[PDB]
Design a protein around this ligand. Sequence first.
Ligand SMILES: *[C@@H]1O[C@H](CO)[C@@H](O[C@@H]2O[C@H](CO)[C@@H](O)[C@H](O)[C@H]2NC(C)=O)[C@H](O)[C@H]1NC(C)=O
Lengths: 50, 50
Amino acid sequence: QPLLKYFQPVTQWLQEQNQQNGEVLGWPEYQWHPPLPDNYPEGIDLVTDE
Amino acid sequence: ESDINYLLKMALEKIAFLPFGYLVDQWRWGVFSGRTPPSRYNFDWWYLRT
Ligand SMILES: *[C@@H]1O[C@H](CO)[C@@H](O[C@@H]2O[C@H](CO)[C@@H](O)[C@H](O)[C@H]2NC(C)=O)[C@H](O)[C@H]1NC(C)=O
């Protein structure tokens, strides 16, 4: 309870932002795994930063 | 040879079931005690199955 009381403003802001963005709390689809990048073992030194 | 045939016939239903029975009640114990909230029914079910 003291931990949740300390983080009350940030958690209120986070709840409001998540509700506005319409996100689902938690992670259903627990089986999902990200796909391997194309030519992964040899294409690592490529800049992809915006 | 006939004895091995009969014993493998019997072990397909009396040994393949032993993981299932323990699995079923173990899952339900977790659900009742609160260690598997309604957001983790399938996650824990398939963890026990595998
Ligand atoms: C859980 O997975 C099921 C099965 O893949 C999902 O149902 C499919 O969802 C996609 C994405 O909207 C649809 O294109 C399919 O038509 C759906 N199939 C059926 C049979 O309904 C479901 O959306 C997933 N649920 C969650 C909460 O992630």
